[PDB]
Amino acid sequence: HMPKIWTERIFDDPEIYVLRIDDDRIRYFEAVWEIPEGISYNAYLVKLNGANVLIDGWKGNYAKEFIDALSKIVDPKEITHIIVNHTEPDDSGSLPATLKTIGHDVEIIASNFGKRLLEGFYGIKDVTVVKDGEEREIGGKKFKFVMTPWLHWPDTMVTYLDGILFSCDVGGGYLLPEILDDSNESVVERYLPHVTKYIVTVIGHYKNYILEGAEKLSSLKIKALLPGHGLIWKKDPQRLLNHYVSVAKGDPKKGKVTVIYDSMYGFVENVMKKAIDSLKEKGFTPVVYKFSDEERPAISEILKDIPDSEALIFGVSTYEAEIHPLMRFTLLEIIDKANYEKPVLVFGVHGWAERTAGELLKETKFRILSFTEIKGSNMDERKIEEAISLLKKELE
Amino acid sequence: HMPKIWTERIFDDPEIYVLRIDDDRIRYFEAVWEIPEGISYNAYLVKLNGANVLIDGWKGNYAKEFIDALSKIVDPKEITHIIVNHTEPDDSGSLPATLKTIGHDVEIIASNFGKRLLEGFYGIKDVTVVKDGEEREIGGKKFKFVMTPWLHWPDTMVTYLDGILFSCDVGGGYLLPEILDDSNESVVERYLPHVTKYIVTVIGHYKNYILEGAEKLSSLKIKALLPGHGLIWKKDPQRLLNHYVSVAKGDPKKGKVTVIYDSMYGFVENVMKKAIDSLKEKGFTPVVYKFSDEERPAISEILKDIPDSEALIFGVSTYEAEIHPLMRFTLLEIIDKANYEKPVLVFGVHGWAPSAERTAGELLKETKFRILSFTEIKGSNMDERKIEEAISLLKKELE
Numbered sequence: 001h002m003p004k005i006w007t008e009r010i011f012d013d014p015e016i017y018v019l020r021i022d023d024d025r026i027r028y029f030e031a032v033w034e035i036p037e038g039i040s041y042n043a044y045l046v047k048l049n050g051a052n053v054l055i056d057g058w059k060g061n062y063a064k065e066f067i068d069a070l071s072k073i074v075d076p077k078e079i080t081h082i083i084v085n086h087t088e089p090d091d092s093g094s095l096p097a098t099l100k101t102i103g104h105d106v107e108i109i110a111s112n113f114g115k116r117l118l119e120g121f122y123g124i125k126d127v128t129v130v131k132d133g134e135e136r137e138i139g140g141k142k143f144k145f146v147m148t149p150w151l152h153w154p155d156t157m158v159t160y161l162d163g164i165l166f167s168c169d170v171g172g173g174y175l176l177p178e179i180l181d182d183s184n185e186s187v188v189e190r191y192l193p194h195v196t197k198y199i200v201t202v203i204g205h206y207k208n209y210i211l212e213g214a215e216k217l218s219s220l221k222i223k224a225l226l227p228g229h230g231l232i233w234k235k236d237p238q239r240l241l242n243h244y245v246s247v248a249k250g251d252p253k254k255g256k257v258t259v260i261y262d263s264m265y266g267f268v269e270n271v272m273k274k275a276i277d278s279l280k281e282k283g284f285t286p287v288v289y290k291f292s293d294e295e296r297p298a299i300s301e302i303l304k305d306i307p308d309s310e311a312l313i314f315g316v317s318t319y320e321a322e323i324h325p326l327m328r329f330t331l332l333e334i335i336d337k338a339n340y341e342k343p344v345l346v347f348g349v350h351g352w353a354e355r356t357a358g359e360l361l362k363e364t365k366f367r368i369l370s371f372t373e374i375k376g377s378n379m380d381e382r383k384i385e386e387a388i389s390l391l392k393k394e395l396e
Numbered sequence: 397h398m399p400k401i402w403t404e405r406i407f408d409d410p411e412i413y414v415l416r417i418d419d420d421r422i423r424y425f426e427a428v429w430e431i432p433e434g435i436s437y438n439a440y441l442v443k444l445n446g447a448n449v450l451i452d453g454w455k456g457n458y459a460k461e462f463i464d465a466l467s468k469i470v471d472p473k474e475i476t477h478i479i480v481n482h483t484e485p486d487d488s489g490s491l492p493a494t495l496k497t498i499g500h501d502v503e504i505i506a507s508n509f510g511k512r513l514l515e516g517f518y519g520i521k522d523v524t525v526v527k528d529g530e531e532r533e534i535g536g537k538k539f540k541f542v543m544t545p546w547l548h549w550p551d552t553m554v555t556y557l558d559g560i561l562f563s564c565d566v567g568g569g570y571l572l573p574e575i576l577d578d579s580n581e582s583v584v585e586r587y588l589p590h591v592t593k594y595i596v597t598v599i600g601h602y603k604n605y606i607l608e609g610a611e612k613l614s615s616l617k618i619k620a621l622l623p624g625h626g627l628i629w630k631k632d633p634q635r636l637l638n639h640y641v642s643v644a645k646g647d648p649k650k651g652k653v654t655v656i657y658d659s660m661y662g663f664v665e666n667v668m669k670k671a672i673d674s675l676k677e678k679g680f681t682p683v684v685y686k687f688s689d690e691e692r693p694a695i696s697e698i699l700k701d702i703p704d705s706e707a708l709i710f711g712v713s714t715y716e717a718e719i720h721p722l723m724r725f726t727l728l729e730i731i732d733k734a735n736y737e738k739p740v741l742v743f744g745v746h747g748w749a750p751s752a753e754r755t756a757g758e759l760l761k762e763t764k765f766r767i768l769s770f771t772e773i774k775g776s777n778m779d780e781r782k783i784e785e786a787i788s789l790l791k792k793e794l795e
């Protein structure tokens with residue numbers, strides 16, 4: 001079993017190829033986010049009169065495969081320019097091998113911070129810095145460079161060529177789609193939730209910069225969006241940009257409530273089962289994640305469901321001086337990646353001295369409607385109904 | 397399927413049975429600690445002249461199995477006493493079903509906090525509270541109750557019966573060994589690392605109370621230790637007590653260094669590979685835990701290896717942030733469960749995080765760990781000499 005590689009001419013004029021590798025070996029993106037669905041690395045080649053322009057690259061463990069694939073569509077000795085929109089090694093790891101294969105000087109183009117990172121990572125010193133809005137005539141065509149910082153590093157930019165946007169992480173998603181582009185509706189619908197997962201896990205801390213970036217790109221006429229991961233968008237690139245904006249804003253789906261809890265011995269479970277049944281009774285559709293002694297949800301899946309939730313509900317055990325370690329971890333990641341102005345209910349056990357969840361959420365945009373104590377024998381089921389009814393009233 | 401259940405007479409004078417169930421369904425103890433090896437729940441029955449004393453129980457999902465097994469060695473209606481050394485539901489979950497099966501009042505013995513927790517968990521109210529050192533004559537024998545608080549809850553006590561200590565979590569371990577007791581040396585040797593894993597994960601926050609508890613029990617002649625999880629110790633209970641104390645004190649195994657790192661892209665891995673080679677060249681035997689894009693260690697296994705390490709070495713990815721999620725979780729759990737005065741080396745990438753973010757070093761600095769140096773993880777121009785300097789500094793500190 002070898003990774004699937006796509007090499008296809010995607011435009012006739014300008015003459016543009018994609019080189020895409022489907023990474024089905026990776027398990028944890030950035031060594032953290034669970035992606036059993038995989039991720040692609042997409043690089044591009046523009047073949048012109050007097051220039052051949054490589055745009056981005058592949059992860060470094062696939063450097064040999066990249067050189068071999070590239071060599072089927074151009075002599076590497078004839079590459080003249082390499083554009084690096086973002087220097088993170090999932091997109092730049094093949095660059096040292098590429099430069100060695102080319103075997104002579106080439107013009108490397110990056111943002112100001114990108115130049116600093118290429119020096120730090122790889123010792124590459126001969127880098128041309130492009131400034132915001134700068135245009136460069138290469139091979140008879142106008143390339144325009146637009147800085148879109150903090151999507152998700154300070155080095156990030158997008159390259160515009162006659163309406164075609166090479167955007168690297170901007171517009172990426174997880175998943176290995178069965179086609180290259182947005183030409184099939186069923187594929188698009190299956191893909192978009194993996195775009196949401198990518199946005200929150202990779203970009204979520206910087207989600208306000210998605211809004212700034214989309215506003216900046218709105219001044220360009222975009223015919224196609226060619227990102228570094230996932231589908232290419234030739235039919236309807238605005239649909240992808242709209243989805244990015246919707247996730248960044250946290251636009252909710254009516255009725256959706258995400259319920260996250262730990263249960264050690266069934267006490268939290270007993271309360272949360274009743275809360276979930278009450279949600280359904282009242283017309284909501286819960287999405288449930290339970291940390292138990294047999295089950296351990298993926299944090300990337302929890303995070304994916306936050307942006308379009310109308311509300312969140314947490315069930316928390318106290319543990320030593322604080323709260324259950326996996327609920328601590330989950331809350332810290334939600335705060336870091338998915339800090340939205342949404343209502344929350346907390347159900348909690350009292351500890352030896354359960355203010356922790358509120359302290360964690362204090363400096364966030366979430367608003368806790370109520371805290372309800374999880375008791376054992378003498379639990380008052382009416383207080384569960386009270387809390388769900390309060391949430392329903394808040395969302396009317 | 398049905399778990400393995402053991403029911404065996406383990407003493408004749410007095411007549412004592414163990415009822416042990418091997419939980420091969422559980423995956424995460426306390427819904428957090430990875431235990432592919434499983435854990436047993438051990439309860440005991442003491443049959444005396446005029447009394448039948450049940451000591452502890454099984455987790456609640458096995459309550460039906462517990463009643464059926466108990467009924468093979470005694471008519472439950474003839475039970476007169478239940479001793480609850482600790483109320484956590486892995487040991488007490490079968491109690492409500494047991495009381496219903498008995499069908500009449502029994503004397504339930506617990507600590508003061510134990511009584512409070514039995515009411516809160518189960519609504520059980522008629523509980524006899526025993527104080528520290530209290531003795532009670534039951535069935536012609538003296539039962540002595542010794543409070544051992546915070547091992548690992550405020551309710552914890554141990555029951556001493558003429559040299560036999562029923563200790564519940566105190567002296568427990570993970571693993572489902574192929575025999576009941578400590579009579580096979582190869583089993584004991586394979587078992588003890590799973591005892592260390594149990595100590596750190598369950599009791600580690602309160603390891604100072606292990607030392608206090610051991611001191612308290614040292615005035616008693618202990619001929620056997622019968623815990624709530626794992627092996628029973630009839631041949632050499634002092635070996636187990638010494639192990640608990642050694643783990644609590646963090647007695648190191650010479651040459652052992654534990655190396656823990658996250659490599660987001662491979663730059664940390666390149667430096668840590670060189671650090672590991674240098675450790676080996678200087679005579680150390682590293683144990684290595686790597687978070688990468690393809691592999692993820694169990695946090696319970698990291699924690700198990702801390703107590704007998706001479707030192708820890710951390711490799712920390714930063715870039716946009718000072719501490720990433722898995723190394724944050726790991727560091728916070730080491731601080732919570734395995735907070736020892738041991739030397740540490742930190743290797744870390746120089747990132748661009750906002751200055752107000754806590755660094756990995758600043759966090760470790762709060763603790764008993766002693767950071768000997770910080771070494772920058774660089775890319776192409778990394779100076780191997782700086783790696784060797786750090787390992788040499790560690791060797792100087794450790795001898």
Ligand SMILES: [Cl-]
Pocket residue numbers: 262263264265266267268269317
């Ligand atoms: Cl619980």
Ligand SMILES: [Cl-]
Pocket residue numbers: 328329332724725728
């Ligand atoms: Cl954490």
Ligand SMILES: [Cl-]
Pocket residue numbers: 658659660661662663664665713
């Ligand atoms: Cl790295």
